Amino acid sequence: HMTEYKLVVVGAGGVGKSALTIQLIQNHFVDEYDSYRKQVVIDGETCLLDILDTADQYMRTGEGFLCVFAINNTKSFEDIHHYREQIKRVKDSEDVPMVLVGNKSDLPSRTVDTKQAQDLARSYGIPFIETSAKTRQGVDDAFYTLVREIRKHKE
Numbered sequence: 253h254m255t256e257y258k259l260v261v262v263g264a265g266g267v268g269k270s271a272l273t274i275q276l277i278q279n280h281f282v283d284e285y286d287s288y289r290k291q292v293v294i295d296g297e298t299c300l301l302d303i304l305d306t307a308d309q310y311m312r313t314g315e316g317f318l319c320v321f322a323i324n325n326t327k328s329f330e331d332i333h334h335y336r337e338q339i340k341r342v343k344d345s346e347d348v349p350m351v352l353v354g355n356k357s358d359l360p361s362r363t364v365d366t367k368q369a370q371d372l373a374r375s376y377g378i379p380f381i382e383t384s385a386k387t388r389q390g391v392d393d394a395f396y397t398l399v400r401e402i403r404k405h406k407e
């Protein structure tokens with residue numbers, strides 16, 4: 253009686269992958285710190301999210317990917333290319349359900365601008381969502397949007 257969606261959260265160390273997950277799961281922001289399950293209704297469908305917060309089973313059986321960089325970490329952003337190439341290789345396709353997420357939007361020290369991010373997502377043909385795990389801005393949006401991307405690609 254529920255649809256399972258297998259989601260994988262990728263990106264460089266320190267960008268907020270766990271923080272984003274833990275917000276989704278626990279509704280709490282963790283300052284300092286596997287697989288998680290969340291039941292949630294999305295467009296009137298009851299979904300069981302199965303979320304791997306990384307750092308290979310999930311890499312090959314993942315249905316959709318959150319590719320996360322932090323907006324005050326230029327290197328994280330530049331590393332998106334590597335994660336996305338990884339995903340394309342291990343799924344052997346050039347259109348895998350993916351959302352580009354730019355986290356830590358609450359922070360003032362911003363070195364990747366929103367134009368950079370929009371241009372990257374536009375090149376890849378994917379949504380870009382700005383988030384803060386600290387304030388919860390964008391968090392449900394990113395996960396819900398990924399679900400909707402997965403639905404878009406297949407039954």
Ligand SMILES: Nc1nc2c(ncn2[C@@H]2O[C@H](COP(=O)(O)OP(=O)(O)OP(O)(O)=S)[C@@H](O)[C@H]2O)c(=O)[nH]1
Nearest residue numbers: 265266267268269270271282283307356384385386
């Ligand atoms: N201000 C702020 N800090 C954040 C936010 N998301 C995470 N952080 C902080 O950034 C640090 C890294 O977050 P964390 O979730 O541990 O990273 P990660 O991407 O999971 O890192 P990894 O080592 O396991 S591969 C932590 O100190 C966390 O509190 C956010 O949106 N805003």
Ligand SMILES: [Mg+2]
Nearest residue numbers: 269270306307
């Ligand atoms: Mg982590």
